[PDB]
Amino acid sequence: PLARIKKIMKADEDVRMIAAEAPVVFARACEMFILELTHRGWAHAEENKRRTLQKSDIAAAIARTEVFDFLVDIVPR
Amino acid sequence: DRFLPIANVSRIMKRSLPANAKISKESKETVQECVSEFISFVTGEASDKCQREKRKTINGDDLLWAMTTLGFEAYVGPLKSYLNRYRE
């Protein structure tokens, strides 16, 4: 979804032009980001012996990951 | 103008999890906005580096500088081989 990754990249302040390679490297970076967030969420879900990945699990993944300290605005801890 | 990414997030999550694992309605969406926040949090850090050099364009070398400074060391390894191949 190259167009939106550019649209959101320039929607939020960006410095003018975007090289064509930046959204391509971003979608892959977004792909690896969903992985780690989904890996970390389901690890919390499976540790609680639940087979359903719910909204609560992503809050736990953001909470104790210092890598995702910037995401606590979305999840009420 | 904080637009959301596509429903293609659903399918990336499904391939990330084992076969015996299924996903909720709003856990789909929580990631959709956590990855929308991820694009803005990276673009802003790299934009500052671009301005340090009065550069009016943002490239893949800046986004990967941004994720290195912001603390995604697990990402910059594979992403370098992916970006250099895109130019190969």
Curated annotation (Swiss-Prot), chain B:
Induction: Circadian-regulation under long day (LD) conditions. Expression increases in the middle of daytime, peaks around the end of the light period and gradually decreases during the dark period and beginning of daylight. The keyword Transcription regulation applies. It is found in: Nucleus; Cytoplasm. This is Nuclear transcription factor Y subunit B-11. Belongs to the NFYB/HAP3 subunit family. GO terms for molecular function: DNA-binding transcription activator activity, RNA polymerase II-specific; DNA-binding transcription factor activity, RNA polymerase II-specific; protein heterodimerization activity; sequence-specific DNA binding. Its main location: nucleus. Residues 31-42 are annotated as: Subunit association domain (SAD). Disruption phenotype: Early flowering phenotype under long day (LD) and natural day (ND) conditions. Decreased plant size, number of grains per panicle, yield and dry weight per plant. Keywords: Cytoplasm, DNA-binding, Flowering, Growth regulation, Nucleus, Transcription, Transcription regulation. One of its GO terms (cellular component) is CCAAT-binding factor complex. Heterotrimeric transcription factor composed of three components, NF-YA, NF-YB and NF-YC. NF-YB and NF-YC must interact and dimerize for NF-YA association and DNA binding. Interacts with NFYC2, NFYC4 and NFYC6. It comes from Oryza sativa subsp. japonica (Rice). Probable transcription factor involved in the regulation of flowering time under long day (LD) conditions. Functions as a repressor of flowering, independently of HD1 and GHD7. Controls flowering time by negatively regulating the expression of EHD1 and HD3A. Regulates plant height by promoting cell elongation in the internodes. Component of the NF-Y/HAP transcription factor complex. GO terms for biological process: flower development; negative regulation of long-day photoperiodism, flowering; positive regulation of unidimensional cell growth; regulation of transcription by RNA polymerase II.
